[PDB]
Each structure stands twice: as structure tokens, then as C-alpha cells.
Amino acid sequence: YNQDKMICRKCYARLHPRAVNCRKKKCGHSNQLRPKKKIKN
Amino acid sequence: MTKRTKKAGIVGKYGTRYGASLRKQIKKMEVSQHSKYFCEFCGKFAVKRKAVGIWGCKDCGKVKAGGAYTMNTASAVTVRSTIRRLREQTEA
Amino acid sequence: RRAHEAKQKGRHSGYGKRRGTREARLPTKILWMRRMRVLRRLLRKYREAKKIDKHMYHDMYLK
Amino acid sequence: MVKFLKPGKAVILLQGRFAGRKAVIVRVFEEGTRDRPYGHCLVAGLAKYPKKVIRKDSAKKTAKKSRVKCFLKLVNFTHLMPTRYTLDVDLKEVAAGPD
Amino acid sequence: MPSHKTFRIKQKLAKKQRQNRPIPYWIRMRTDNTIRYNAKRRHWRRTKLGF
RNA sequence: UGCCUGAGCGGGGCGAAGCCAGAGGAAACUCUGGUGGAGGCUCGAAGCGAUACUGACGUGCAAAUCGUUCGUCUGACUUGGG
RNA sequence: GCCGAAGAGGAGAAAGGUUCCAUGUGAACGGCACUUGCACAUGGGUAAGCCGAUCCUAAGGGAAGGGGUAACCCCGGCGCGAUCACGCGCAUCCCCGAAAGGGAAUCGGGUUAAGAUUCCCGAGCCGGGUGUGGCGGUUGACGGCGACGUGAAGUCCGGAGACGCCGGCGGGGGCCUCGGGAAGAGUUAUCUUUUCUGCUUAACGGCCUGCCAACCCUGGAAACGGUUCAGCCGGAGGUAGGUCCAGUGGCCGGAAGAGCACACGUCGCGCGGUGUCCGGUGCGCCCCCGGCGGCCCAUGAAAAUCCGGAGGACCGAGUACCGUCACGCCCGGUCGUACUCAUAACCGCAUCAGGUCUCCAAGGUGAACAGCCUCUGGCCAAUGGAACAAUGUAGGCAAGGGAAGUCGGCAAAACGGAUCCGUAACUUCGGGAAAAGGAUUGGCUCUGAGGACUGGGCUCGGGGGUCCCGGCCCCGAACCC
């Protein structure tokens, strides 16, 4: 799948394409996600 | 012209680098395609290039085969005219 | 943040301290993106108050 | 709060392919019928002619075009009725006397 | 992902890993003969795993 | 070397198509401001390459390595996997 | 102090293969000590309907005639109804081939020494597979001009999935930021206080003011009008205006007085407060997404699956027929999951200055490079001690001369950003060009100039005009007695 996972800029914690938000510790709709740009070199 | 002496069309694509016999032709032969053209069906100044030899009118959407560079040309015209004349002599 | 209050409020716009490169700092296309939206927003407000004609509005919009 | 006669959602579209659109919500199965994956939901334009091929949502689809596929059938029929009437005249005249 | 998953390599790797254990204090004692330096016993840093 | 299918290229500079205004001409088309932005294009980041000290090392960190210099960097580009 | 796209942060692919956690040791290792450890020994840990495998199909590995070749080896009916049991229809087959193409469904909180979106607690949904009732309907649906919104065998046609490069507007998000300023933290040879953390909550059942594009809608009827960043669009009817469709990781609002700490205050419980705070700026076009124009002697995957158009044989009586809601249930039957992912867990004989892939391009000033930073976070590399000579390797600066040195100005120094001014020969007029050359630059303060909303001088002529309170009559009227 071309979506890969979304990895949070604060915590750096990976949480889905279906989850709206991160939550690794209270990250808690911080919405500070960017997806895996979908594969390189 | 605007800020153009000689003339250009493409010629920046070469730059200073590249060279002259070939430059006399290649403005002419990409730019003659670029020339908005009136569609044979509708008449609006729609016709633009889909691919090599492929032309399409933006408003009506009628897509046509034609020359590589140009919408048309002498050769196609001559062939159509000859065919029409032949059919008309047979009908007679 | 006091450096931002230290821009607020001019300063440092003699030539020297003022520097990234010429345009990069703001390409003037960034000022056009402001100007071009405003000049068309003014022309829409001016009609709907009614000050100009349809002939004048075309020419100036073209201008 | 009425049941119902109340707004909401199956398709018209946008010109990236074949001609269209106009198709009709009779409809949602899982949902109104627009822009998804695996499509879930349902479009028709009822029937016997804007001449739908319809094709399918939830999508980016291109229904073939409503006034044009009735004028393409009604003009096929308006062309079929004079071409039959001329054939029916040509045959009446050829059967009666000449060619 | 898993952490390359397939059971069929994964089990056999785990078998060699269970097989690489110390000899059991006892087999030194009843015993026939040997400085019982077991010996097919393999290490995370050195030499290299085989199948 | 090929094929398939993915991924990567801060930012900036220059300014080809042709059209506006302003202005000229009977037309042809022209002048000046100006816009838009084309490119195996330029200066350069990730990334690629490997020119120079003919340095350091030369029983090495290394069976070709290190530092500093230098070339390319939207393309006939680079690169993962299958 | 050092690390800053990671010379040492977070998450992972391959690969390793138990290296992880704990306890106990110390012969060997660690190029040294070692109480330590990724050494030794013994125990322990990895938990999936909703992550991935898995199913599909792509260069191709091909299975399948015939035939060369002894030979190895190599080229090139089935299906479905159908219940009573039985008959009917067709064209190119069938598996592997991506754990990073395509894809049915999950989040938030908690807890473990060691797992965790995996178990729990709460809540949700899916898929697959039998019953139930609410009823929405019944000679196969009303409404809205319209667009369009709220049965069923034989038989054909088909989207999404599903797609190139360049430029690049628009929505809006998490950011970055500021202030009102809670709550609570720093700290004052000498002050103003400012400064700092901090104000945070799903997935998703329900509402939307619902953008753009298409509306050959309707309606109007422009020969110059509308309009863009730009191209453009139009009388195969423009602009108004009465309509539509229609996005989102997106407004609302509910999920949610469900929720653990954030911090302080408490033996423990508790209780309060934060969690129901306000408002906005900066093209940061970033990642997600919807459009446009341009471009190719070069044209940008396929199938699974999801899903409907038709075009219909048959069947529609107090009998009997379907399909969303609701709902009830069962199943959910496979594998993997630890840890490293690297100047110590990979490859290179080594705890090797080498090599080895993806995402985090939104951390703060300054975006010219480079530096410094910080509440993430991480680290002080397997040698120290005491002097400091020459020799050497890294390296700075040397008067006055200025290449005399050397194959060679080699190196190094030197110039340097940026604005204004100005700019030669030659030229395929593209360029040459940042030619050259020369001048400006601080600290600081104000002005000028660049945003959205509302309003903007004296006289004449054109188009349009509202609320509040008190008292009273006759009637209707949700509700209560």
C-alpha cells in the first residue's frame, strides 16, 4: 500500500493512516504527523 | 519584439550552446504546432497537441490524427482531394 | 521574540545587517501575491459601491 | 427533522474522461456516492433514457452525458424515422414506377 | 511488518539456538572419555550462521 | 547492461513561449514598460562523482582508508527492492 | 561540555538469530583496569477479526501438445442453476511472481523486569456466515419543472481500484508566533519584572455555512461582456439569480461530567484546578486533497476486490414478495511479533575511522554558508599519568621586498553577501556577463510604501424604506390543574 504509516514530528511515534492523530504519550490530537513518503534512495 | 532581437520561439532551449542550420528549422517546426488552430468541426481557436500526430480541440473535444508537428499539411489534403475526385467520376 | 519586536519597527535596513540574498528574502512575486489579490479586491469593491462604468472597469482591469 | 424530503447525496462530476455527468441518488449502502476506494453505495439515473451506461461510484467516474445520450437516442430515432420513411418512400416510388 | 516472519526458516534457527546449550553437568561423570569441550557451540560475535 | 515497480533532489539566479497596457502603422507588424515562466541552463542542499595535496596512512582504522580541495546536482539523473 | 538530516535524537527494511530482561559470577574477551558488560552460567519474555503475512496481478519461473535432443535439457469439458433429479451456456488456460505496486476493518487510556495500535478497560467497526421485529414498500417507490434527492432466471455493456513530467492557484490541518492571561516554576553585588512550562484528548454513530470542477439545468439574452496568478470562457447563448452535485487527515457538535498527568497542594483516601480559555497575524502552498495550463520522434502497469447501468423471460388474492434501519449470534479456524538496525548486535576474518535501504525537510535566531542553540532526546568511544626538548604531523602569524622559489603560483593566502552605478573584443545576437571597474553597508529611531471589515466634503437630478414598551377586545393555541 502506498500509504504507508504516519510518523509524528514531536514524539516521532508511528500511528497509522486511519488514526487521525498521534498518541505515544499525551500527544493526543497534536495532529503532528507526516506520512511515510511512500518508499527511496 | 518584446525583448528579442533575432527570434526565438524555442531558441532559449538551445541557449548560446547548440548551433545554426538546425535552429532555422526547429523554431519553425515546434512553434507551428503551438499556434492555436481553429477546429475543423467547431471553428473555435481550441486545437492543441495530445502527442506526436495527435491533435485535440479543447472546446468540442474532437481529437484528430495529423502530421507530427502540424495539424495539417499539403500531403493529407492532396490525398483527400484525389479520393473525392475518383468517387465522383465513378458515380457519373 | 524581542528580535521580532526589533523588526516591528524597522531597523537594520541600511544595506549591511539586512541580508539573505536579493530577492530570496522576499521574491517580489511574494509582494505581487499581495498586490495582485488586493488590486482585484479594490476593483470589486469600487463597482458594488458604483463609481465607474462597465467600459472603464474593463480597461482598468486590463491596465 | 421531517421524514424526509430533506437535502443530501449521489452525483454530478467534472470532465476528466468520457463526457457526462448527470446521475441520480436514488441513494447510500455505505454512504452518498462519492469519491472513495472500494465504492460502497449507489447511483442510477433512472432509466429509459438519459441513456445511462451509468458507470460506477464511489469513484472519479464518468457517466455518459444526460442530454447528449437522449439526443443520441432521440436523434438516432429522429434519424431512423426519416431514413425509414425515405426507404418506405423510395420503395413506394420504386415499386410504383422508377428507381 | 513482522521481523522477517516465515515459520519454516524461523523454527529451525530457533532449534539450532536451543541445540547451542552447555553440556549437562552429568555426561561428564558416567562417562567414557574426554576433556568434554562439547564443541559445536556457536557465538553471537564470531564465525557465522549456516542453515 | 536491460526490465518491472517504488523513492529522492533546501533555496536562490537567469529568463525562452506569447499577450496586456501604453504607444505606432493602411496593413504588415514594430517600440517601450511589463507578465509568465522554457532549460541534458546557471550558483548550490539531500544525493551522485572523484580533480589536487602527487599530503596523512603505507606490518593501516582500511587487501585502496582519512582530512581538506574539486565536479554534477530535473536529468542520457540518482537510487531501494523484485 | 559534546551530538543537530543526526561526525552520539525517534521509528523501521534487509540482514543477524536471542545478542533482549533478571539474577549469579569472572577462567577467557573487551587490544587496559572491571565490582561492569552485547564475556560466562542459569532462569524468564514475543500474545492480532481490525499491524503485517494472506489475495491479486507486473520483468517473468513457468505447468500443458509437438518435436530437436538417447538423455540432461529447450522452444512453444468447465461453469451454473437446480431439488424431485436433472439439464443448460462459453472460449483462450492454471499456479507462483512486490511482506516498500494494488488492498475489507481500531483508537484512546492503562499495565509488564522484559510484549503491546497485540492483553486489559472503555468504545467503535469489519468480514463471513442464520433468526428476529420495526416498517418503508406491494397490479417492482414519492418528492423536485429539471437536475436530482429520500423483485427476478436466460443475456450484453462497465467504473473505481488506476497511475507521466513541469509550473502551480485554491481549501484547511498540525506549525511556527503573539497577546489577553489561568494554573505553577526560575530568580534578584544592583531592577523592571520579564522569562519559562503551561491551557491536552480518539477512532468514529450524527450534523455542513459546504470549496473547485461539471451544471450542454432552469432562467437571463451580452456582437464586448465576464474573468484569472497565468492561459482563458461566451452568444453549439456571458455576466445576475432560482436551483445541483460535490472534498476533507476539514466547520459543527457528539463520542465525552468517557480519559490519565500536568503541576501543586495529601499517611492513604479525597478535593480543587487544568481538561470545556479568547482572538488574530506570517504564500511556512509543507503533507493530505481538488483544479488548471504546458510538454514528449519519448505517451506514463495489470488484476484481485468493491459496485451499479441496463434488459428482462417469471411471479405478485384476509394468501404471499424484497431491501435499509434495528437487532440477535456465531465464527473470526493460519503464520509472525523479543532485541539491534549500528564509530559494539548487519557485510567486511575484529566491539574495523569502510560499506549498507525508507520515514521524521516543522524544533528556536539567521535561510549567503556555516554557527549557536533546547522542555525531545542522547553521549563523554576501551587506556591513563607527569612534562612539554629537538624530530614530525595537524596548524596561525611573520618586517620589507613580491614568484626572485618550483616541472608547474603549485599551495596557501587572496576576492567574497547584497544594492546602486556601470560594463570591452567577439558571437551561431542565445551569449559573452557577476566581464571589467567603482561606490554603499553599523548601532538606533521615525517616516514613506504592502492586508481584511465598517464608514469617507458643498449643490442639482435617478432606485428602495424599520423596531421597542404599556393597556384592551373577539378568535385559534403547544402545556398544567
Pairing of strands B48-51, A33-35: unpaired
Tell me the technique behind this structure.
Answer: cryo-EM
Q: Which nucleotides of F are covered by protein (CB under 7 A)?
A: 6-9, 11-22, 30-36, 38-41, 47-48, 78-80
Distance G400 C1' – B39 CA (angstroms) = 84
φ/ψ of residue D24, rounded to 5? -120, 135
Question: Which chains does chain C touch, 3 or more C-beta pairs < 8 A?
Answer: none
CA neighbor of B71 nearest in space, from B28, B40, B25:
B40
DSSP lists the bridge partners of residue A14 as A7
Footprint on protein of nucleic strand F, Cβ below 7 A: A 2, 37-41; B 1-4, 7-15, 17, 31, 34, 36; C 21-24, 27, 29, 32, 36, 59, 62-63
Residue with nearest Cα to nucleotide F6 C1': A39
Distance G95 C1' – A36 CA (angstroms) = 34
- Is A34 strand, coil or helix? strand
Distance G177 C1' – E18 CA (angstroms) = 59
Grid cell 472513495 — which residue? D36
Distance G319 C1' – E50 CA (angstroms) = 78
User: d(Cα D64, Cα C2) in Å, to the nearest integer?
Assistant: 62
CA neighbor of D66 nearest in space, from D7, D13, D8:
D13
Chain D 9-48 contacts with nucleic strand G (CB below 7 A): 9-17, 20-30, 32-48
- Is B55 strand, coil or helix? strand
Which grid cell is E17? 539456538
Cβ–Cβ < 8 Å for B66, B72: yes
Which grid cell is B43? 471553428
Which grid cell is D47? 432509466
Q: Which nucleotides of G are covered by protein (CB under 7 A)?
A: 9-19, 38-42, 51-53, 99-110, 117, 126, 141-144, 147-150, 157-163, 169-170, 173-175, 177-179, 195-196, 200-204, 209, 212-217, 224-230, 232-234, 236, 244-250, 259, 261-262, 283-284, 286-288, 290-300, 305-311, 324, 335-340, 346-351, 357-363, 365-368, 376, 417-419, 428-432, 440-448, 450-454
User: d(Cα D52, Cα D2) in Å, to the nearest integer?
Assistant: 32
Peptide bond into D4 cis (omega under 30): yes
Q: Give the resolution to one decimal, in Å.
A: 34.0
CB-side exposure of B34: number of CA atoms within 13 Å? 8
CB neighbours of A26 closer than 8 A, spacing ≥ 6? none
- Is E42 strand, coil or helix? coil
- Is B49 strand, coil or helix? strand
Distance G243 C1' – D75 CA (angstroms) = 28
| Rg for chain C, CA atoms, rounded | 18
φ/ψ of residue E3, rounded to 5? -140, 75
User: d(Cα D11, Cα D31) in Å, to the nearest integer?
Assistant: 12
User: d(Cα A24, Cα A30) in Å, to the nearest integer?
Assistant: 11
- Is B67 strand, coil or helix? coil
Cα dist. B16→B12, B21, B26, C6 in Å?
8, 14, 15, 47
CA neighbor of D69 nearest in space, from D50, D48, D53:
D50
Question: Which nucleotide lies at the shortest CA–C1' distance from A41?
Answer: F79
- Is C40 strand, coil or helix? helix
